[PDB]
Amino acid sequence: AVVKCKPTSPGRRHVVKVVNPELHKGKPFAPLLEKNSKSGGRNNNGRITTRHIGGGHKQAYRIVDFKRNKDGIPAVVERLEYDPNRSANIALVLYKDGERRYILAPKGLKAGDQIQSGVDAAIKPGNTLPMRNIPVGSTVHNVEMKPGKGGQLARSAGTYVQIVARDGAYVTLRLRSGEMRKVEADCRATLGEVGNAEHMLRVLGKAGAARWRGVRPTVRGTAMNPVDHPHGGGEGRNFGKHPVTPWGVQTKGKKTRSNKRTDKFIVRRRS
Template sequence: MGRRLISQRRGRGTPTYRAPKKRLNINLLYKNLHGRVVDIINDPGRNTPVAKILYSDGTNSYVLAPLGIKTGEDASFVSTLGKTPVGASVFSIEASPNSGPKLCRTSGSFATLVSKTGKKCVLQMPSKKKKILHSECRASVGIPAGGGHHEKPFLKAGKRWIAMHRRGKLYPRTSGVAMNAVDHPFGGPTKPGKPTTVSRNAPPGAKVGSWGARRTGYRKGKKD
């Protein structure tokens, strides 16, 4: 029998889980103009600070701030892959020319320019996979600011609640085995309970746990 899980009740839509309308909605954009950094903004939806760029024609745009940037400096860290030296670290990379930043936008993540051949540039991504992009794709040279923020512990549950609340995350999260039987398939005082594996074709409300798992727990025996 299916149960109306907490995630399904949240999906109904109430003011409790409604996203705030006054939150910043910043679109990252590159322009082929000379500009300088006029402000560095803390975006609640990102771990990387955002730099506000003022261009020579009087317009503004926002890009991810590299490590060590200051207000008043020229936005010379933005360049095409064809003009970037081999071996340089780049981030906030365009997937195609003029597509806008799409790759390596997480704080502290960057790709390395491995080689250039004609209009093709080879990048080594953070996953160690290599990706071929057009030489006219723009990127920011350096490393995005905000790296290492996961290394600092919260120390207090209240601070973690504030961090999760500002992003609309549910915290603290109650585990299924701690719920009542009416709230979750794993809930209730029944011992030893039920297996965590569930069919891939289970209906909503019953599809919880490990979907179509071949095995659970630690690997036993000889590895393949």
């Protein structure tokens, strides 16, 4: 439920919260946590590789089952939890033999439902089965690219991938970007759209709310000196040049994909 905030102060004027009352109001499950130390966008050389990353609230990492290998054993869903590590909410599930794991929460999943992986699983939102067992034309998420590698496609808060075709060893997918990609028919996928679909309806409202998420401010390139950026300089506002990166690569329109290994897997590009 989106909640428009009342304008008691500027900085609360434009805030829309996304309030989900079903999330667990307690501590997360302690065995599945581990330390997630921040980086600041800096590699092992100490240099800033990717800009604008730094600060933000401390975040513990939640070990999430993407591989989803407990086949045959049914699992009931204990509660839904908030995950700071990702945009989608996660679900704490309890198998029959007593193991607890975290999965990505699908759209219609709530506390108390039963999920089950494996080939003999039913087709309800939550089950995970190889895509030679999933009917053509259904919406799945948490899709593997390689069998047993773990789900890599359609993991962000409201995404999903449709299965449009199958020719023997491959299935053809309609990715969320609109790209048509071939994936082997033995890769696991999880039924239904992924949960937190109204995540994109939030508006942060103030500058500090982006600093809470560890997003340092972005200085636009024309506000610099020519030693700093190709856009920099000028006596006033001058931009008489084609828009490039800080490293002189065209940005408005120039393609950058240079992977000739995976070109056989791409049916059509995005539009």
